């Protein structure tokens, strides 16, 4: 499978950036989360980044911390997350699906078995939040053996060594951390996976800005989760607001 490569070729043909929303799997419950994901797709999400609830998300701000709490409150487990992933792939054959994982959940019962499970449910990439490139060998090797793209964060201040490593080791896309023209060009120079900008992307003008800078598109996390959090009392209102935000964000990527 080559879903990111197919997507980026198709987007480039249409002179278009990617819009990629993040949500936590099973926030605020399994049934509603499945409807949320279907709505993001129906509204124009080019790909998905999906979080699995972890007890100690030390790379996450308060909004995502709360999403996890909500999922745990509903009794969501990584096993249930994987059942959800199977259903999602089966409804939507081509959309790239990326996971955002913490190392313990990958390592827990064997790194190799984790990536084999990702391959079986039809996941395309995994970003392991607390695995820096320095520590990544067994993760990226396992991923690649199971036709999974290992995604790496390229932070706002990366020296040249880091750029070269991220370029060499990543696949699918490079997660370009917001907190600029130098990084995009060097990544291109070192033939890195196409860059997606993420962290604080919450408005349509940020999306157009990313694409204009030379990024392949934009990742929006908290913004989507904020809409969930704001609309817990009203599931229908929630989807409608999600629908609206996604199409707005996606329209901005049409350059």
């Amino acid at each position: 499978m080559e879903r990111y490569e197919n997507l980026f070729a198709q987007l480039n043909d249409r002179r278009e950036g990617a819009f990629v929303p993040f949500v936590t799997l099973g926030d605020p419950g399994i049934e509603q989360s499945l409807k949320i994901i279907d709505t993001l797709i129906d509204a124009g999400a080019d790909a998905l980044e999906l979080g699995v609830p972890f007890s100690d998300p030390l790379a996450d701000g308060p909004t995502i911390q709360n999403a996890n709490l909500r999922a745990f409150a509903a009794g969501v487990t990584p096993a249930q997350c994987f059942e959800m992933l199977a259903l999602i792939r089966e409804k939507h054959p081509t959309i790239p699906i990326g996971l955002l994982m913490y190392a313990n959940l990958v390592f827990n019962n064997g790194i190799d078995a984790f990536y084999a499970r990702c391959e079986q449910v039809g996941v395309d990439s995994v970003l392991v939040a607390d695995v820096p490139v320095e520590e990544s060998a067994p993760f990226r090797q396992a991923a690649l053996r199971h036709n999974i793209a290992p995604i790496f964060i390229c932070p706002p201040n990366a020296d040249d060594d880091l750029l070269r490593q991220v370029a060499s080791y990543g696949r699918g896309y490079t997660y370009l951390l917001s907190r600029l023209h130098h990084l995009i060009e060097k990544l291109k120079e070192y033939h890195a996976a196409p860059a997606l900008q993420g962290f604080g992307i919450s408005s349509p003008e940020q999306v157009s800005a990313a694409v204009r800078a030379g990024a392949a598109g934009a990742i929006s996390g908290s913004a989507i989760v904020k809409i969930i959090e704001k609309n817990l009392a009203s599931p229908k209102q929630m989807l409608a607001e999600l629908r609206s935000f996604v199409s707005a964000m996606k329209a901005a990527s049409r350059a």
Binding site: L58, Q65, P78, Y102, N104, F107, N108, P132, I153, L177
Partner: protein, 395 residues
């Protein structure tokens, strides 16, 4: 690339978001430089001596061992300024922070001792100190919270996850990831990502160095064993470090057995947990079967780190150190016994180490043995805890 080995065998490493790697490499570089700098060493030695009160006494406990062939010494970290061993390494980390040009300190705390230690070091050395403490812990540890405030530190309650030490540890890392240019993260034990296990060992190693000199002076030989409680691993590695190459000296670390290993209500991950990756390191930890991180339980709140220092896991794996556990009740008894027989009120943390030495003595009373227990802290803080148990159990 690092200057030092971030692993102890399979354990350790630097499992942090990419944004935090420059902070860790910066800190490692500063440490390697400081360790070579006689002026740093002289400044650190001076604060230890003239501020913290080093060297600490090595006390022989005659009443306790009467009628056995055990000679028991206690290394008196209870007499250090702040009343526990944590003061040693916060002074060194404070000096590192200053060497790097940082003016602010971040620290996590569970029971509050590390928060107090960080707050006093900061007050002395003119650093702006902020402390993260799980909301449940803030509630449970009013005395330490007010000590921190009287010392000018900002105490920040953490409401996320289980509102305990685990969750203050995450919040410390999240803060540092954005503030590391100006703030140093003063980690509270010999655990977490490299270089912290190494730094904390080296800034606690005067414990074992003094103990070796003092026992040679008083007995003319090395101890048959040194025994220390293991929460995160700092006091124990501080005691062990100088003895690692003295292969006849047993190194015994004591994890909290809580209500008993078999109950599952314990804090003994080294021997009864499972290796995981969390808090920047690969180490045994308390975790669910699908890998969510759990809390450690002990009567002693200071032994609640749900993992253990990677050097301990390594020392265990090669058979250089042995690790055991001691239950709440065994710790309570050793606490009672020290107060009544030696006039020393030990921390309930330290009472786990003592309880184990009392077991070694009582189980084999005609075994010739020369033992040192690291008395990591004083137990004034524990007097109501020990009251309300011997109240609720009649007595």
């Amino acid at each position: 690339t690092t200057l030092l080995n971030p692993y102890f065998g399979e354990f350790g490493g630097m499992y942090v978001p990419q944004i935090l790697m420059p902070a860790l490499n910066q800190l490692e570089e500063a440490f390697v430089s400081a360790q070579k700098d006689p002026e740093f060493q002289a400044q650190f030695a001076d604060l230890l001596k003239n501020y913290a009160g080093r060297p600490t006494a090595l006390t022989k406990c005659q009443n306790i061992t009467a009628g056995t062939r055990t000679t028991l010494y206690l290394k008196r970290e209870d007499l250090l300024h702040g009343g526990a061993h944590k003061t040693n390494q916060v002074l060194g980390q404070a000096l590192l922070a200053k060497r790097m040009g940082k003016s602010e300190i971040i620290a996590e705390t569970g029971a509050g001792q590390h928060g107090v230690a960080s707050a006093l070091a900061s007050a002395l050395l003119g650093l702006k100190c902020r402390i993260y403490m799980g909301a449940k812990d803030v509630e449970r540890q009013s005395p330490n919270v007010f000590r921190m405030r009287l010392m000018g530190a900002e105490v920040i309650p953490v409401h996320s996850g289980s509102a305990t030490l685990k969750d203050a540890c995450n919040e410390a890392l999240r803060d540092w990831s954005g503030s590391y240019e100006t703030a140093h993260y003063m980690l509270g034990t010999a655990a977490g990502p490299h270089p912290y296990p190494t730094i904390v060992r080296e800034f606690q190693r005067m414990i074992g160095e003094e103990t070796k000199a003092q026992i040679l002076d008083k007995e003319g030989r090395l101890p048959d064993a040194v025994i220390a409680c293991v929460g995160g691993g700092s006091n124990a590695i501080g005691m062990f470090a100088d003895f690692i190459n003295d292969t006849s000296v047993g190194l015994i670390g004591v994890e909290p057995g809580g209500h008993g290993i078999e109950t599952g209500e314990h804090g003994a991950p080294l021997k009864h947990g499972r290796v995981g990756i969390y808090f920047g390191m690969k180490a045994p930890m308390m975790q669910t079967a699908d890998g969510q991180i759990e809390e450690s339980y002990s009567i002693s709140a200071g032994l609640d780190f749900p993992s253990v220092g990677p050097q301990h896991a390594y020392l265990n794996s090669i058979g250089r150190a042995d690790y055991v556990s001691i239950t709440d009740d065994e710790a309570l008894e050793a606490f009672k016994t020290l107060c009544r027989h030696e006039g020393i009120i030990p921390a309930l943390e330290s009472s786990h180490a003592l309880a184990h030495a009392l077991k070694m003595m009582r189980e084999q009373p005609e075994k010739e043995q020369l033992l040192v227990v690291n008395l990591s802290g004083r137990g004034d803080k524990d007097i109501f805890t020990v009251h309300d148990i011997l109240k609720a159990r009649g007595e």
